[PDB]
DNA sequence: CTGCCTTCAG
């Protein structure tokens, strides 16, 4: 079956840049490839067919070149509009395919999240839940790792991170990792920690506090 | 000027099947195929098979045979895709997309999409709890335990508008949960209030939480 | 079995 390779998985680039995304096939496909962008929130849209031909609409700083095994949109001088996802897909016969896609983010200074924690709170705590809070605000790249510590132990379990989409008006990221244990658990140990590594620092942001506290 | 009106959001049981449908205007319904496409939550394309209207001709992705019905009415130029025996695998935002004068051609136009949900979970209002600190202060409100999506969260009915990150909700056991920050100046809280509003619409339910000190 | 063809046209 025919398999679409595309790469890279996320480019980061500035307003006019030249940006190039690369598809390739497993087999030949001729010049049977499409290309389509996809912004977040939104259906997606036909960039170009049969390699090279731009669709109705279609602004003439991207294009697209290749033929056989290898294939590559380029967009001349990136525009605000342009980030976003980008996917190829053959048209030589079935069962189609896409490409897992390239995702287009803007170029920032780097910036270190700002790390808060939360303990459970009285109300939660009264209905024998306790959820852990952290926010990892306003950092970037993308490209972050969250640890929770309980007494020193590394944990696993119970938690689950949500990540905000590039910000529009900033460009940058922010997540929120939420440790969910039961008022008992909780009430077993003292020390909670937040640890996040990035590359803004060799050091993780720690963020701690403690129960009998 | 091609149009694919989608059918609205689909809330389905595990076992169940759903038909939605996909209304053509803006061209010949007839001399074109039409594709459906599935896409997860953040995740890639997939392709599930087209429908010629001409003559109810499909071919499919060998994956949803059996899973993906599709059809079409010429008298209304909809088309139809109806699945069966959803599992929450099945929960994703389908297309349909306008494919080629010829069949093998590049898919064009494509719908706004239909999301279907596959849960058993029944209408249930979120527990808001706040978030207080154990120079700019973050507070925060954790909005867990409802169905189904969406809620919204301002802060200060409204006034409270930068500093503000409200995340994705994700599932916990087949109920919603998210979280929304808010950074503000020290001089501000606790001196002034800070609070929380969660409209979960779905309920018709209203929560006001008051984030104070510890 | 389920073919062939790649953009304004069976």
């Known amino acids: 079956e025919l398999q679409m390779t595309q790469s890279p998985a996320s480019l980061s680039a500035s307003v006019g840049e030249t940006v190039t995304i690369t598809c390739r096939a497993s087999?030949?496909?001729?010049?049977?490839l499409a290309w389509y962008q996809q912004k977040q929130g939104k259906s997606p849209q036909l960039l170009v067919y049969?390699?090279?031909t731009l669709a109705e609409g279609v602004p003439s700083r991207f294009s697209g070149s290749g033929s056989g095994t290898q294939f590559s949109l380029k967009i001349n001088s990136l525009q605000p509009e342009d980030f976003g996802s980008y996917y190829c897909?053959?048209?030589?016969?079935?069962?189609?395919?896409f490409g897992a896609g390239t995702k287009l983010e803007l170029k920032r200074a780097d910036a270190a999240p700002t790390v808060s924690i939360f303990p459970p709170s009285s109300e939660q705590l009264t209905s024998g839940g306790a959820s852990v809070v952290c926010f990892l605000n306003n950092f970037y790249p993308k490209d972050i790792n969250v640890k929770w510590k309980i007494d020193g132990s590394e944990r696993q379990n119970g938690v689950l991170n949500s990540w905000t989409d590039q910000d529009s008006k900033d460009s940058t990221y922010s997540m929120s990792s939420t440790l969910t244990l039961t008022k008992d658990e909780y009430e077993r140990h003292n020390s909670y920690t937040c640890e996040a590594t990035h590359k803004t620092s060799t050091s993780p942001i720690v963020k701690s506090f403690n129960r009998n506290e | 000027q091609v149009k694919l009106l989608e059918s609205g959001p689909e809330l389905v049981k595990p076992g169940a099947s759903v038909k939605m449908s996909c209304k053509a205007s803006?061209?010949?319904?007839?001399?074109?195929?039409m594709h459906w496409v599935k896409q997860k939550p953040g995740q890639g394309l997939e392709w599930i098979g087209y429908?010629?209207?001409?003559?109810?001709?499909?071919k499919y992705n060998e994956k949803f045979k059996g899973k993906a019905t599709l059809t079409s009415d010429k008298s209304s130029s909809t088309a139809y895709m109806e699945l069966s025996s959803l599992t929450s695998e099945d929960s994703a935002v389908y297309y349909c997309?306008?494919?080629?004068?010829?069949?093998?051609?590049?898919?064009?136009?494509w719908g706004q999409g239909t999301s279907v949900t596959v849960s058993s979970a029944k209408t249930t209002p979120p527990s808001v709890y706040p978030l207080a600190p154990g120079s700019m202060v973050t507070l925060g409100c954790l909005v867990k335990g409802y169905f189904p999506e969406p809620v919204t969260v301002t802060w200060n009915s409204g006034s409270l508008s930068s500093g503000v990150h409200t995340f994705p909700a994700v599932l916990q056991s087949d109920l919603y949960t998210l979280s929304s920050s808010v950074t503000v100046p020290s001089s501000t809280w606790p001196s002034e209030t800070v609070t929380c509003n969660v409209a979960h619409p779905a309920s018709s339910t209203k929560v006001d939480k008051k984030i104070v000190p510890r």
């Open positions: 997309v306008r494919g080629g004068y010829r069949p093998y051609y590049a898919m064009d136009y």
């Open positions: 803006g061209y010949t319904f007839t001399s074109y195929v």
């Open positions: 429908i010629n209207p001409y003559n109810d001709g499909t």
């Open positions: 087999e030949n496909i001729y010049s049977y």
């Open positions: 049969n390699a090279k």
């Open positions: 897909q053959h048209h030589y016969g079935t069962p189609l395919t």
